[PDB]
Amino acid sequence: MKTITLYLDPASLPALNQLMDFTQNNEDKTHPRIFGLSRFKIPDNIITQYQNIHFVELKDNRPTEALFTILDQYPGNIELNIHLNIAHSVQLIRPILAYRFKHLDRVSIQQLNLYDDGSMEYVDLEKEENKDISAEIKQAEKQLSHYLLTGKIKFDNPTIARYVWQSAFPVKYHFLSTDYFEKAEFLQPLKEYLAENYQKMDWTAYQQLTPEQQAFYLTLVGFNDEVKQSLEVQQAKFIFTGTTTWEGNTDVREYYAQQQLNLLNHFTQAEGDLFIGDHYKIYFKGHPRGGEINDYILNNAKNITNIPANISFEVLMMTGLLPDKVGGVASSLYFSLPKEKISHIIFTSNNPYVKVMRRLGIIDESQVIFWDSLKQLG
Ligand SMILES: CC(=O)N[C@@H]1[C@@H](O)[C@@H](F)[C@@](OP(=O)(O)OC[C@H]2O[C@@H](n3ccc(N)nc3=O)[C@H](O)[C@@H]2O)(C(=O)O)O[C@H]1[C@H](O)[C@H](O)CO
Numbered sequence: 001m002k003t004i005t006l007y008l009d010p011a012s013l014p015a016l017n018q019l020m021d022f023t024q025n026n027e028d029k030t031h032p033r034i035f036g037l038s039r040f041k042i043p044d045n046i047i048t049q050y051q052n053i054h055f056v057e058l059k060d061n062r063p064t065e066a067l068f069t070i071l072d073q074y075p076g077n078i079e080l081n082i083h084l085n086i087a088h089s090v091q092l093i094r095p096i097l098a099y100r101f102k103h104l105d106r107v108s109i110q111q112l113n114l115y116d117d118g119s120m121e122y123v124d125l126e127k128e129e130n131k132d133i134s135a136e137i138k139q140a141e142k143q144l145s146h147y148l149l150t151g152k153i154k155f156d157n158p159t160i161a162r163y164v165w166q167s168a169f170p171v172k173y174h175f176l177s178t179d180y181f182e183k184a185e186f187l188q189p190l191k192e193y194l195a196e197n198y199q200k201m202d203w204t205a206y207q208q209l210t211p212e213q214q215a216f217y218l219t220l221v222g223f224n225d226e227v228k229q230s231l232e233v234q235q236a237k238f239i240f241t242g243t244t245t246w247e248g249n250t251d252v253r254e255y256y257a258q259q260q261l262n263l264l265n266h267f268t269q270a271e272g273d274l275f276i277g278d279h280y281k282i283y284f285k286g287h288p289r290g291g292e293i294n295d296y297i298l299n300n301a302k303n304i305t306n307i308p309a310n311i312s313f314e315v316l317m318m319t320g321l322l323p324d325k326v327g328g329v330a331s332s333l334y335f336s337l338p339k340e341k342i343s344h345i346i347f348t349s350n351n352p353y354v355k356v357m358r359r360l361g362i363i364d365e366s367q368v369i370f371w372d373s374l375k376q377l378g
Helices: 013-024 066-071 094-102 119-126 133-150 178-183 185-194 211-221 225-230 250-268 292-300 314-318 352-359
Strands: 002-009 033-037 053-055 078-085 107-115 171-175 198-200 237-241 281-285 304-307 325-329 342-346
Touching (some): 002 013, 013 078, 013 211, 133 185, 171 178, 178 198, 178 352, 250 292, 281 292
Parallel strands (some): 078 107, 107 171, 237 281, 281 304
């Protein structure tokens, strides 16, 4: 009798897509919505415009028990419209399925919309190169049935399991690279299975919105006039892109900071192996979770312009503000960049990430550079 919409993501790229869906549907002010986005905070003056709007924390890649308190407020027949991170889909839906068990008479799942975490899904798929993919799919379907019927998780192939939701629900997949599913010949049985249930992430969606909706969207993603003006400068531009480590430990985080600064110097100094030229204006776009690694760059480099780390690179493409050249450590941002704009991509210290980028033609056949092979300058 009533639809409720849920938006869930611990990372960056699925949340960016989901905030576009919310913008497209923003005229309806009373439609029930539940936001679980770890990296995005919806501004207060947008929140006040809406009724039946809710928020939930994620812990260990799943909504917390606070979800159940929200759902208890809707005592009629309810249908759930769910948006999810692909790599983390099994854990993110876990508490939703548990609630459904308790209220079988009134709670149903209407549909799923799923979006890539990023490079993770592709590096993971590359590791499956030698397997019988057709057989893997049939087994994953069986094991998904057990999850839906019992509530217990056990998959022989956690990677392939991410792609079999259509056997239970109406679904739509949104991929960072549809080309990968064409070019990886071993994956043909998966492409065939998915049929009409997938599309590429649509980076032209912003252009189709009204002026009012475009402003609404830029507010959601943290884009502001000051950043816009810094990129409208009349000079050739280079953006240095940063990385992070999910290692908590001090020793590794400090090493990443040191090697990343040395890498910057190889682009910007005359004696550097990757010298771009004296005529470029230099920018820094740190990783959203770089933390102290980002601070090390700003503290120890000179003549560099910061772009706030929380702003997703892809927003620059949407707004038509891409620079001449882009360089740094391998990132998901490089998957949707025009090839003319790539300077050098460096890998961290046969490598599956290297293989993925080679298949897609993002890098060529020449020997790749790992950052521990670079001379310590100065
Ligand atoms: C293989 C693997 O594990 N890939 C994951 C990936 O699926 C995803 F979890 C993420 O993707 P990652 O490639 O870092 O980049 C994801 C998105 O973050 C924004 N971005 C990133 C870097 C930057 N300098 N400016 C930006 O704006 C862009 O919107 C981009 O599309 C992530 O944390 O979201 O982190 C990586 C790695 O764990 C990480 O790179 C550390 O090695």
